[PDB]
Amino acid sequence: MHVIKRDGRQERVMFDKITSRIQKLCYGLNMDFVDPAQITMKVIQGLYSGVTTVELDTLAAETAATLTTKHPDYAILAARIAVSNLHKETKKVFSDVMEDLYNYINPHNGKHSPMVAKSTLDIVLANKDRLNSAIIYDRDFSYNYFGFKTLERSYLLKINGKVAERPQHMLMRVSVGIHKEDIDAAIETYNLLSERWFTHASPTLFNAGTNRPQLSSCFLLSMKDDSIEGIYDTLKQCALISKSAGGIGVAVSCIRATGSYIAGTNGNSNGLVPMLRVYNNTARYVDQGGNPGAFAIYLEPWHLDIFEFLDLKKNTGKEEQRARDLFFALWIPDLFMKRVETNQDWSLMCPNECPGLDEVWGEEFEKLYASYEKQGRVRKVVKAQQLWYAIIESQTETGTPYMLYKDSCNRKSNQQNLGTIKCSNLCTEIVEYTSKDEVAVCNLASLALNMYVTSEHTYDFKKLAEVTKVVVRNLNKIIDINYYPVPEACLSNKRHRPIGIGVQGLADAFILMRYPFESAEAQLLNKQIFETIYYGALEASCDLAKEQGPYETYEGSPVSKGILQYDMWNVTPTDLWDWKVLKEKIAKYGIRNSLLIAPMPTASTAQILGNNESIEPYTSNIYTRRVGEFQIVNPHLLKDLTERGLWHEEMKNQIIACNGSIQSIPEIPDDLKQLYKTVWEISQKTVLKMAAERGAFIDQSQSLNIHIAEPNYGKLTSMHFYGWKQGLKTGMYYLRTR
Amino acid sequence: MFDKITSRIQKLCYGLNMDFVDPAQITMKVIQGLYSGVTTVELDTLAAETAATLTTKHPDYAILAARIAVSNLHKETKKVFSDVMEDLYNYINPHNGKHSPMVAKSTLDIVLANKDRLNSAIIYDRDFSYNYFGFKTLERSYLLKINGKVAERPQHMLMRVSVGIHKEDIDAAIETYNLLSERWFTHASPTLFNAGTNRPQLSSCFLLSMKDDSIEGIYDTLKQCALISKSAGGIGVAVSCIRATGSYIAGTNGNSNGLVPMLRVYNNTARYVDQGAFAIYLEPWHLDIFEFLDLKKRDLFFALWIPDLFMKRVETNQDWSLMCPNECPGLDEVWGEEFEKLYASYEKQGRVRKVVKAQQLWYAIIESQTETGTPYMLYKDSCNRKSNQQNLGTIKCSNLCTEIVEYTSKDEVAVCNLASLALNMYVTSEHTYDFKKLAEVTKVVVRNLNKIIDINYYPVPEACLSNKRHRPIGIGVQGLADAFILMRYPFESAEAQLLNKQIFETIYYGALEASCDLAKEQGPYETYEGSPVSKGILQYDMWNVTPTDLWDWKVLKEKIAKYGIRNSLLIAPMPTASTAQILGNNESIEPYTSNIYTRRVLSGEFQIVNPHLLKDLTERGLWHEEMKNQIIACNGSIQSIPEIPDDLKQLYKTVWEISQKTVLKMAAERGAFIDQSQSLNIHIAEPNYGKLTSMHFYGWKQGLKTGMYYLRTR
Ligand SMILES: Cc1cn([C@H]2C[C@H](O)[C@@H](COP(=O)(O)OP(=O)(O)OP(=O)(O)O)O2)c(=O)[nH]c1=O
Ligand SMILES: Cc1cn([C@H]2C[C@H](O)[C@@H](COP(=O)(O)OP(=O)(O)OP(=O)(O)O)O2)c(=O)[nH]c1=O
Ligand SMILES: [Mg+2]
Ligand SMILES: [Mg+2]
């Protein structure tokens, strides 16, 4: 048997040499369980002569990754093999690749189509030496297989279907893309990114240092006014945003209900459903071409078209009464929740008959709403619980609508001084003001929370604060570099300068510290982590305000009155940080950014870093990743089981037989059982309480999924009302069942 | 008893044919609707309904039915016009309490300041001049209602429209009221709905060109369509500049979804804003053409804007090149030789996305038409070559009903302003045709439509700009089939073919003469210089036709040469569906499609026979029930009934029995005196693809701008 080497030369297939190559990539790996010869063994099995070394390497990487279920270090080794191959197939110098990317000519068009911006190239070429040698290519080997494959599919710029960028090249591109002539700052960011302390959001990773850079790609809009002109002006906006691959949250409550009089045409309105069909089909059409844009529609439950809204996503239906490509969210007043639990009547209104209900929150809302009721300006009254049942029925069928508490959102916004906030975003973590003149933008990054635990099971709070400060500075530079799809978005970001720093690997950080998710230790660590993030962020924002002045609309805001997020929740922080000293710095200089913290879903970027998503418990101890499908065991648990000598073939079988649970396996000690409880075994009320406790230090909101195995009306009711009573801004993102 | 009811019916039979109208026949049905507590008004609807069911015995029953229903209306409405206009203005909507005038303040003030002359000029006996079905059409949509009760008499409506158009010009208001109430012509439905009201959108049609080939442009145009569709107007949209499926997007590095998913957004918009009908025009070189020929196979109507080059390639069995407008720009901005040179240049340059047999595309078009009746067939080069607006640039589409050929661009949406002459009115008691009177009324219609241009509520600024720059109008017709019948002329006869030429020579002549008088009083339209008529070329010169000796075209050309004209375009025979139903005429230029047809009036169905035919048959003692049923069994034909004279069989051929090439040729001949185009349906009973193919090609070769509106197959 012969391999065809890269140089096209024929080489004898040899067990020792293949094993040998794998061996050289095993530095720092657990050799008690990782065996190079194990891979060589399975590779040589199904192997025919005529295979190339690139094919051989691919096979060996794919084989190493099926052995992840024997030890997690195998997944790292698989990436090490893949990257080894990628290095052999790539140019070594950064500035070289940047030239190749810029000089790109489309083959079937003949047109010069630079893949990076000229001004980025220029900065790179002016600083070749420092930039090229700052790069540490050994950092490419820090990923696991599934992280690498995510990067490889979407994130490494390709020349004619062939990957041209090493992970390190991409990271330096982003860094120069953010910092331009500030080479000191670029290298600081490159080091932080490549050592995996944090990551910028996908939009930034994709387009930093490219032409017309789309660095932020989540947006929020309010319907202009209640007219064909307003509706179609907003539609154009959403189309234009969606063309730039922007996700959107849209507030729709100002639009007349079905049957409402139209004084102009002497006819009656079709209401929300037919209009939302236009938006649905706009989402399908403007999907960047060939592949659907994502719009989350926000509706307040006093609106007369609420029941039909609650149906638009049902898979069983009537097509013309369906909009299954949109996402649905409720923007809920406290009054509704209070009428539900007291079993009172709820009045359904048309916003044209009852104007300004969306422009008003809390006591002002309850007062305006109560007088409309007293004046008999109501279209239909139902028992409030009837609407409640429709809500929970919808969630049991579809997992939605999302649950947002309008008064919580507004009562505890530092953007309070701008007017009433009418909605959240696609992912329910952003609470930012919108108006006719203003489309809000989400500028996002996440901290990797697992990275701040030390070899001694202590949490490095100082490091976390220091990294956060860099993140604030980076996102603040992104606000000015960003190419905006509509000018209302630019206006909004330049005026209030919000940002959204989030997290990943919360579950990993608990496990690394040896804390069960529900323990006193994890609940206190949870507060501490988020105090820290809020503290460092305010401090960076304050520093930028000293250097550049506060944001335009700073005067009048709660923070300008010395009110921080936890003051709004009536929470007293722990003694970890001196908040009195921070307040005194803020009183001096103000802050650069109206909002700072917003834990988003980290679907794609958490996979790249190899962390569990967001603030979420591991949903299972055994799960699959699609690339073929690959079986993955929780890497923390697998190490524990192998270190103890407990792991075997049937042991994996029994955990799959238990739906990824380890609770009923008698050979596992109880301390391990409590460490590795699945989300399905963890109290959702506890999840809700932990979110509220970290919530006091999050000036935006958090994308909170809820997991109820076998839901009924009683389960869904008690969890929603618990979340509400905790003070949560987002009571639920998705509902997950099984 | 029976006597009191019969006599009451008899009192409204004046002038009717008593050989066939029998009031006791109505009484029998009314008699059994009696009870203690029955009002004579309730018995009056029973009498009008019964009389209307008896229309199938003689058409005068429908007149009796109308006279009964109108007597009820007169007793349930106020008799003085200024009083009714006041009640319409003072209307307070009780749901909110907000004052919501149903007429404009400026109209009421004109009425009140002139109420002596206006109240007294009205002739309420003219309310009885509609038959039952025409009056029921009026009553349901055309007469303003206060809390579900009709406030406007037809006379009130017609005088409201007249002051709506003419305002302070009372003399012109009354002249128009007289012509309308005597039914010499009618204004289009939107004018009848909206004149003298707060939102006077008086125009019927709009046409638009797709702005840019981008998301921005697609969604700006969409907004335009939503805004227009708010004002109930129909829409023609040119779409050929939008890049085809799979074409590269530079800004997103993706591939365009093509026409279909774009059209679904428009479809949805049409459904959503009713208070909506868009016609989509595509040129057959567009790469998405085959997938376009499938969308209706949904609230959109489809049309082809066809170059001669495609037609030439089809008949010569050659290849046709499909192109994406992003790879091959400008194909729609150019027509005739300029298109053919550009098109061939792209062919030779290799920039062609797909090449098919022209015949393959041709048959895909045929199959689509036999299944759905569409796409409409428009000949882009004929439309352009013979247009007075051709000095503006290439015309990119027509309208919803294919009669309007007007320029569109980024800056201009075309609108048309429409009316129709009732051609049956102009046949004389001596079976001659009053051309002098037709010309006269036409002159009034031109002036009415010019006033409409200036007072119109425009839904978008681009529509306003377009109409004020070029001032196009569209004067059409109805009851052409009735004019032939009244003259005793079979549709296809030499006498009908000549009267057809003469009628349209006359309309064009009178229109041009009024437009020329207006140009003298007010100056020509802004864009007049450079146009074909400024060079002394009238429409018929463009067809190479010499008019008959009926009208003095030399003298008229002298007047135009000296003063020019106020309107860039004048004539456009539209379908007239609703207003023809009001006036009791057959629509437009088309033959009777059947001698027996049904009309629904709410919960009632009524069998109606061609009124001329029913008069001929009853008078000859031929009409009976097995006779009616025989004709129904023959799909409304009388050709196979032995007891009917050949004279009558020749006169009452249905459109299915009339040669479609003759229809096309008669369209071509009147078309030389038609400024725009005409809504032309083709009717083929047993349709093979060969028959249809030879009808498209015959119509094309005849020089027709619209080769086909709808294909009907049964
Ligand atoms: C025109 C139109 C409006 N609408 C809806 C959309 C808007 O929410 C609402 C008002 O549309 P508008 O465009 O504002 O209608 P209008 O201005 O003529 O009437 P008014 O003065 O009473 O506002 O009605 C329809 O549902 N269908 C329609 O055809
Ligand atoms: C963005 C987008 C465009 N399109 C279509 C609509 C337009 O006809 C066409 C161009 O869209 P454009 O808005 O013009 O896209 P672009 O300007 O970024 O790309 P280019 O430089 O090539 O013009 O592509 C889609 O079908 N789907 C999409 O998601
Ligand atoms: Mg309005
Ligand atoms: Mg473009």
**All domains in chain B, ordered by first residue:** 1-714 (3.20.70.20)
Q: Residue B466 is which amino acid?
A: S
CA distances from A666 to A647, A648, B333 (A): 13, 14, 80
d(CA B208, CA B236): 6
Nearest to A17 by CA among A53, A69, A45: A53
d(CA A50, CA A3): 6
Residue B567 designated active-site: no
CB B712 within 8 A of CB B678: no
**Residues 6+ positions from B616 with CB-CB distance below 8 Å:** B648, B651, B652
Contacting residues of B for A243, CB less than 8 Å apart? 215, 251-252
CB A239 within 8 A of CB A295: no
d(CA B606, CA B604): 7
B377-387 in b/e form (b: 16+ CB < 10 A) is bbbbbbbbbbb
Q: What is the 3-state secondary structure (H, E, C) of B374-426?
A: CCEEEEHHHHHHCCCCHHHCCCCCCCCCCCCCCCCECCECEEECEEEEEHHHH
Q: Whose CA is nearest to atom 20 of ligand 2?
A: B250
For residue A202, say whether it is annotated as part of any ligand binding site: yes
d(CA B593, CA B683): 9
Contacting residues of B for A270, CB less than 8 Å apart? 272, 274
Strand partners, B206: B235, B415
For residue A243, say whether it is annotated as part of any ligand binding site: yes
Pocket probe mutation, ligand 2, options B212, B215, B259, B260, max atoms within 8 Å of Cβ: B215
Interface list for A 225-284 with B (CB within 8 A): 228-229, 231-233, 235-236, 239-240, 243, 245, 261-267, 270, 274-275, 277-278, 281-282, 284
Distance from CA of A97 to the nearest CA of B (A): 20
Report residue B539 as tokens.
């429409």
Q: How far is CA B162 from the centre of its chain?
A: 21
Contacting residues of A for B261, CB less than 8 Å apart? 281, 284-285
d(CA A545, CA A589): 6
Resolution, angstroms, 1 dp: 2.4
Residue B550 class from Cβ within 10 Å (0-12 exposed, 13-18 middle, 19+ buried)? Answer: middle
Q: In what order do the strands lie in the sheet with B474-478?
A: B185-187, B418-422, B474-478
d(CA B212, ligand 4 centre) in Å? 8
Alpha helices in B231-335 (DSSP H): 260-272, 289-292, 308-315
Active-site residue (options: A238, A427, A442, A542): A427
CB-CB under 8 Å, A285 with B264: yes
Concatenated DSSP letters of B292-305? HTTS----EEEEEE
Alpha helices in A315-419 (DSSP H): 334-342, 362-374, 384-398, 406-411
Residues written for chain B: 714
Nearest to B578 by CA among B255, B70, B186, B283: B186
Closest residue in B to A213 (Cα–Cα): B251
Q: Which helix (H) or strand (E) holds A738?
A: none
CA distances from B113 to A333, A432, B109, B167, B170 (A): 56, 58, 6, 11, 11
A 10 A CB-CB count for B606 gives: 20
Task: Find the CB nearest B273 among A228, A233, A277.
Answer: A228
Report residue A141 as tokens.
């080997």
Q: Residue A309 is which amino acid?
A: F
A212 touches chain B (CB under 8 A): yes
Q: Which helix (H) or strand (E) holds A236?
A: helix A228-243
Q: Is the peptide bond before A36 cis (omega within 30 degrees of 0)?
A: no
Nearest to A217 by CA among A444, A4, A449, A523: A444
CB B85 within 8 A of CB B161: no
Report residue B153 as tokens.
């008499």
CB B438 within 8 A of CB B510: yes
For residue A553, say whether it is annotated as part of any ligand binding site: no
d(CA A381, CA A348): 6
Distance from CA of A272 to the nearest CA of B (A): 10
CB B607 within 8 A of CB B510: no
Nearest to B62 by CA among B2, B21, B15: B21
Active-site residue (options: B397, B401, B416, B516): B401
Query: β-strands B300-306, B319-322: how paired?
Result: unpaired
- Please state how this structure was obtained: X-ray
d(CA A200, ligand 2 centre) in Å? 27
Distance from CA of B350 to the nearest CA of A (A): 13
Is residue A278 in contact with ligand 1, taking CB distance under 6 Å? no
Is residue B201 in contact with ligand 2, taking CB distance under 6 Å? no
Active-site residue (options: B139, B152, B283, B403): B403
Q: Residue A329 is which amino acid?
A: A
Residues written for chain A: 738
A 10 A CB-CB count for B104 gives: 20
Dihedral sign, Cα of residue A123, residue A125, residue A126, residue A131: positive
Nearest to B693 by CA among B417, B359, B415: B359
**Residues 6+ positions from B388 with CB-CB distance below 8 Å:** B531, B532, B533, B539, B568, B569, B675
* Region of B37 on the Ramachandran plot (φ > 0 left; ψ -120 to 50 alpha; else beta): left
CB B541 within 8 A of CB B387: no
CB-CB under 8 Å, A231 with B227: no
Active-site residue (options: A207, A410, A425, A493): A425
Residue B401 designated active-site: yes
d(CA A691, CA A724): 12
Concatenated DSSP letters of B246-263? TPEETTTTEE---SHHHH
Q: Residue B621 is which amino acid?
A: G
Backbone angles phi, psi at B85, to 5 degrees: -65, -35
Is residue B364 in contact with ligand 1, taking CB distance under 6 Å? no
Is residue A483 in contact with ligand 2, taking CB distance under 6 Å? no
Is residue B242 in contact with ligand 2, taking CB distance under 6 Å? yes
d(CA A736, CA A617): 13
d(CA A184, CA B29): 101
Strand partners, A569: none
Any idea which ligand is nearest the CA of B215?
2
Closest residue in A to B248 (Cα–Cα): A289
Backbone angles phi, psi at A581, to 5 degrees: -70, -40
Q: How far is CA B413 from the centre of its chain?
A: 20
CB-CB under 8 Å, B226 with A285: no
Q: Is the peptide bond before A167 cis (omega within 30 degrees of 0)?
A: no
Q: Which helix (H) or strand (E) holds A156?
A: none
CB-CB under 8 Å, B269 with A278: yes
Nearest to A354 by CA among A256, A428, A442: A256
CB B550 within 8 A of CB B376: no
Task: Find the CB nearest A290 among B220, B255, B274.
Answer: B255
Q: Whose CA is nearest to atom 10 of ligand 1?
A: A227
Report residue A631 as tokens.
């079986």
Nearest to B107 by CA among B455, B581, B348: B455
Residue A429 designated active-site: yes
* Angle made by CA atoms B389, B392, B393, in degrees to the nearest 5: 105
Q: Residue B357 is which amino acid?
A: K
For residue A731, say whether it is annotated as part of any ligand binding site: no
Is residue B93 in contact with ligand 1, taking CB distance under 6 Å? no
Report residue A196 as tokens.
């995996």
Task: Find the CB nearest A285 among B230, B262, B269.
Answer: B262
CB B514 within 8 A of CB B565: no
d(CA A465, CA A456): 19
Closest residue in A to B262 (Cα–Cα): A285
Closest residue in B to A274 (Cα–Cα): B272
Q: Residue B303 is which amino acid?
A: A
The DSSP symbol for A340 reads: H
d(CA B519, CA B539): 18
Any idea which ligand is nearest the CA of A263?
1
Contacting residues of B for A240, CB less than 8 Å apart? 215-216, 219
Q: Which helix (H) or strand (E) holds B574?
A: none
**Residues 6+ positions from B444 with CB-CB distance below 8 Å:** B175, B176, B179, B185, B514
